[PDB]
């Protein structure tokens, strides 16, 4: 499973 993308947390 892919790690969550920090971009969905901070822009």
């Amino acid at each position, epitope marked *: *499973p*892919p*790690p*969550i993308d*920090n971009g*969905d*947390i*901070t*822009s």
Partner: antibody
Amino acid sequence: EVQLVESGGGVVQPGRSLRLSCAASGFTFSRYGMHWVRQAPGKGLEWVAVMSYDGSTKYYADSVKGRFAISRDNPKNTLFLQMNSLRPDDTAVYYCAKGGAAAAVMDVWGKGTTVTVSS
Amino acid sequence: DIVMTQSPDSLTVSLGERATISCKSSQRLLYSSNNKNYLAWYQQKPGQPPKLLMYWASTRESGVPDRFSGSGSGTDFSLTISSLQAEDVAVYYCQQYYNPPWTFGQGTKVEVKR
């Protein structure tokens, strides 16, 4: 430089609620996800919850899921934690934490606010 | 949920000597698609809030002195303080951020032997 000041801690009776705040300064609050993390006295760090930059995304620890609600107010540069159904094991320092640019880490921490659940 | 286990619970080091803190993840923290390890280290000196030391296993945060080295890949990680100084007494925490819930190792206390 970046500053996070927590507030709202104190003592609460078992069963009741408490709302914490985090006043962020020294960066564009609108662009960053923010976390709540806690530490029972003499104990380890425990991630509580996070809310994304624009507020459309949350995640909670299982420990608090359904009991706690993270929210934020971007124009007022403020992060909140609404805590419900508190128990003595929720007793802890509650740190507000800023997310890294960078990587999903907490790069800056407030000093925390101390919450005590007791009779 | 990814479980992070540190070893040991406590180190007592002579000034100028080496402290080695181990951190073991229950899940591979390496992402094939970018070859980065989603692992961080934090330092929390007594009475203070935590500070971020390392991320992507080995990238130092700004201001972190160069006696601190983060390394490892996969499930097995390490924080080494070469040549320990008095300031460095603290509890050190590893943390995965591969996936929610963000999870911390239990902490490793470091003290000086004198």
